[PDB]
Design a protein around this ligand. Structure first.
Ligand SMILES: NC(=O)c1ccc[n+]([C@@H]2O[C@H](COP(=O)([O-])OP(=O)(O)OC[C@H]3O[C@@H](n4cnc5c(N)ncnc54)[C@H](OP(=O)(O)O)[C@@H]3O)[C@@H](O)[C@H]2O)c1
Ligand SMILES: Nc1nc(=O)c2nc(CNc3ccc(C(=O)N[C@@H](CCC(=O)O)C(=O)O)cc3)cnc2[nH]1
Ligand SMILES: [Mn+2]
Ligand SMILES: [Mn+2]
Length: 159
């Protein structure tokens, strides 16, 4: 089972200049809760952006080039990435835009954070067919002293 997890600002913006230009500790905490103890697949630019392994998860990096860090697993295709996860119940695809596009056809489940923020982007989440997906969980949070936008956790499952 393949799932995508991502946080989307207005217009599906997910990144700018190889970062997320927001700061929402509560969303990072949701990301960790939903990924811990599962393998995470990411593209090389997202690997660079995070800048270090995510602990407690098997980190699998897609790149056409040989790997440059043996603390993580490097693979050269979608199918190799999936195989490197092994017999696991749930594989978490953690981006970025190019990787999300490739895994979205195989995915059964999306974990999307909808952030009420206007930010210029150079990377987007795929323009996914909404009719394909059932919303099974929604949880809205107002901004607070730690989280300077409102945000909504959503889980969708392919119908
Ligand atoms: N808001 C969020 O939830 C979120 C999540 C993740 C990332 N982001 C943001 O998204 C941006 C990065 O996304 P991006 O689209 O630029 O890059 P990306 O998808 O992270 O990485 C693309 C790279 O991955 C490799 N790759 C992808 N598919 C491959 C395949 N099938 N076979 C082999 N290699 C493959 C290639 O590396 P090579 O060039 O080495 O071949 C490619 O250049 C950053 O701004 C980041 O902060 C945001
Ligand atoms: N919902 C969601 N939010 C994100 O920020 C996000 N980020 C990525 C990729 N980038 C990142 C960047 C940093 C960390 C990170 O530092 N997470 C730590 C923090 C734990 C804590 O803040 O609570 C982790 O252990 O997961 C994870 C992913 C992919 N999907 C996402 N999905
Ligand atoms: Mn806002
Ligand atoms: Mn919805």
């Amino acid at each position: 089972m393949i799932s995508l997890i991502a946080a989307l600002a207005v217009d599906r913006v997910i990144g700018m200049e190889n970062a997320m230009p927001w700061n929402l500790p509560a969303d990072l905490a949701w990301f960790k809760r939903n990924t811990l103890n599962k393998p995470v697949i990411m593209g090389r630019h997202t690997w660079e952006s995070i800048g270090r392994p995510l602990p407690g998860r098997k980190n699998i990096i897609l790149s056409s080039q040989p790997g440059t860090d043996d603390r993580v697993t490097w693979v050269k295709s979608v199918d190799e990435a999936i195989a490197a996860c092994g017999d696991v119940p749930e594989i978490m695809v953690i981006g970025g835009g190019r990787v999300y596009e490739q895994f979205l056809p195989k995915a059964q489940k999306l974990y999307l954070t909808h952030i009420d923020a206007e930010v210029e982007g150079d990377t987007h989440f795929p323009d996914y067919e909404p009719d394909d997906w059932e919303s099974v969980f929604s949880e809205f949070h107002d901004a607070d002293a730690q989280n300077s936008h409102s945000y909504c956790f959503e889980i969708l499952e392919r119908r």
